[model samples]
Target: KQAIHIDNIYWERVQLYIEGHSEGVDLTSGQFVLRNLTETKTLEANEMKIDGNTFICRFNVAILDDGYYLPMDKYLFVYHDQLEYIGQLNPNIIDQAYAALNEEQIEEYNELTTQNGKVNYLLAYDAKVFRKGGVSQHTVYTITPEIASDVNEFVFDIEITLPQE
Candidate 1:
């Protein structure tokens, strides 16, 4: 048995709006890449354009796969020599798995209560549990420039989900 069964992960599109303040900076020259947390897989931008001070980059719709289940996997949005952003587009499987467990199961899997225990338990055990699934419509994620010294702000419009069908 497995603790959770997550469906295929998909994204309709990804748009990045980068606002820059410096003059003579070719922001569009930089590339945008969607890479898994381990940097093992990367999806590059399909197209990019510039509008005034904003640089727009778009990645076409596609399923995310790299021989490993994507659920609970963290992905990184990176623009080399520019900035990198980490965001969640998947459900919190740790919490979901914990919720799916019964009191007896919790007692039996005592590690479920310790610090970093839920993740440890999931890594060690398996079950065929399927509970929740859904998608987000045009979610806007904004990040300030504190992490990156050059950019002013970054806004991303992303539609991602663990599909029901």
Candidate 2:
């Protein structure tokens, strides 16, 4: 929680006040948009529907702080570069597309992802698993900032459904 301050106390200025409040009807009614494409954009709800919505949860390694949270089997469109190269996936942006595999289930991903066909590039991800196999790991320092363009973002996705909702 936090507090806000303003030079004026007028009703008109109330709307102008800025804070991280994420609840209330009026607060939720306001529009929040994120963009990353020629014409693509993302919208967020003001409040979470916790009364009756069902969910299947999963936790994967990612950056420590982000604006949203996600559950397992969610569908998100991360750039091939991000999911395959860098390691952070935004939970809020992904949809409940499918379930992530447990260790036993991960075997399926291992077998299919081999040095054979289109699946050659696939690999199981686990904090406990990292061989490197002498493959040089590369890091991206930064990208030159841009003001406006068709590719507003590289990674994006949202969940399809809560487990039962």
Candidate 3:
């Protein structure tokens, strides 16, 4: 975890809007974390407003010694103690992941789906279950900020499926 400074002169404010539907899972109690590709550094929302399945938060971006205004290759991680019940491996979940991809990713997705044999849907969307010390932790969703230079907001819509008991 790292401290983010929104009051800095170089800092720029951005809003994050996340909406999703969870089957047999409660998303109200979950939290979101923004992290770099390697998960070495993390930024938490200044404050998150959760209304049912929707989450809204604001973050500060600035060019730091380690990187630029947030890594171009960053991702959002959903954290909850009960995340184990969410079936990220389900094949159908891939469809929901598709909605969040950018054009470059869509091209990749198209190519992957056209290939023979089985498609690793998760890989197509750059999504996966992140773990620590061999224990399941949270779901990772790769996001692309549109018009990186002029964009002041990022949106991610996802669907989660819970395994039947």
Candidate 4:
């Protein structure tokens, strides 16, 4: 596993409260890069700790069929310059990202049998996972559009799939 640091630019932006910053991140365009902000190298729901923040996150890198992939490490960032924006990817942005993918004819949200023989609902056309860090805990979660607009509810919880001993 590898620790994926936040893009320097974005990470600096998020470091505002630590010093002083951010009234809000304005979305200039409809898209932004969605990345796994973990210090450890892992794909499935793994414990992520960043700047004293920690969360269990299972990132779905294969959200689109036509999305980039392998060697080049292109798909991991899920960069869509068209969705070009200057802010972070929130729930609203997630929605737009999915829409953009669909417009490009990229199929989303496929289901597959996990190693544990459980069905994981990979987010294809749904809200994306986000990092939630407070005074003590940090967790990766998706916003429930029907219930809340922010990270206040757990519509779909990504459990850490551990190896069978």
Clashes in each model (backbone N, CA, C under 3 Å)?
A: 6, 15, 0, 11
TM-score against truth, every candidate = 0.35, 0.18, 0.36, 0.19
lDDT of 2 by residue, 11-79 (tens): 121011111222122222223222223223333322232222111112222211133434211122211
Poorest stretch of ten by lDDT in candidate 2: 2-11
lDDT of 4 by residue, 20-43 (tens): 111222222212233322212223
Comparing 1 and 4 by TM-score, which wins? 1
Candidate 4 residues lying further than 4 Å off, grouped into runs, are 1-21, 24-89, 100-151, 154-158
RMSD of each: 14.6, 20.9, 16.2, 17.7
Query: What would the C-alpha RMSD of candidate 2 be, to one decimal place?
Result: 20.9
Candidate 3 is scored at a TM of 0.36
**Alpha-carbon local distance difference test for all models:** 0.38, 0.23, 0.36, 0.26
Q: List the residue pairs that clash in candidate 1.
A: 1-126, 1-127, 2-126, 2-127, 2-128, 3-127
Arrange candidates by lDDT, highest first: which order?
Answer: 1, 3, 4, 2
Ranking by TM-score: 3, 1, 4, 2
- Model 2 residue runs over 4 Å out of place are 1-38, 48-87, 90-103, 111-165
Question: Which is superior by lDDT, 1 or 2?
Answer: 1
lDDT of 2: 0.23
Per-residue lDDT of 83 in model 2: 18
